[PDB]
Design a protein around this ligand. Sequence first.
Ligand SMILES: Nc1nc2c(ncn2[C@@H]2O[C@H](COP(=O)(O)O)[C@@H](O)[C@H]2O)c(=O)[nH]1
Length: 196
Amino acid sequence: MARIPPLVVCGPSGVGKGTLIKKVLSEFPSRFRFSISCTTRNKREKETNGVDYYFVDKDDFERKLKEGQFLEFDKYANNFYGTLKSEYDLAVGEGKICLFEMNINGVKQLKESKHIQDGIYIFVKPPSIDILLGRLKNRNTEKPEEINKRMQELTREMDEADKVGFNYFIVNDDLARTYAELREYLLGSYPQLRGG
Ligand SMILES: Nc1nc2c(ncn2[C@@H]2O[C@H](COP(=O)(O)O)[C@@H](O)[C@H]2O)c(=O)[nH]1
């Protein structure tokens, strides 16, 4: 009998999917385990190694890849990101729903993986592209090239999301409203789920 399907959250940079995920984990902390991805990008000052990501250098990312540690990986905006088999295994051992956050290429890979039989895939959209571009611009500290790459990824992502096979599309206009919608979708999708 099938394991409980992982929850997979995808969307463009600047859409607020990280905050939505933190709200899910806040309401349902005993029910989900967040998959801590590896990334080669620089850690921001209030991110934490071993909570948000495992921040590694590109050499160590390549070593991990070649040693067979990843279920999927991609290059996004000049850095590498990857989902560890061990992190999915920890969720499974704990009897929890694994919660992944990954980009559209990672989604495509997970859907073809023989390690995971099914999943619930959600794409988070902005209220408008203009609003999202404005949100990216409000990141005072990111370099123009970094913003540039994230906006280039946005174009691809918005173009392809319709073709990938998401179970649900949600528009993050306001966190309270959007989370109220999201939690009802999750409760409907996971009859096993309750708060706490
Ligand atoms: N394919 C893949 N994408 C990831 C992974 N972790 C984060 N990402 C994606 O990479 C993009 C950039 O993440 P950020 O640098 O903004 O944290 C986001 O779309 C994020 O969801 C991963 O393990 N695999």
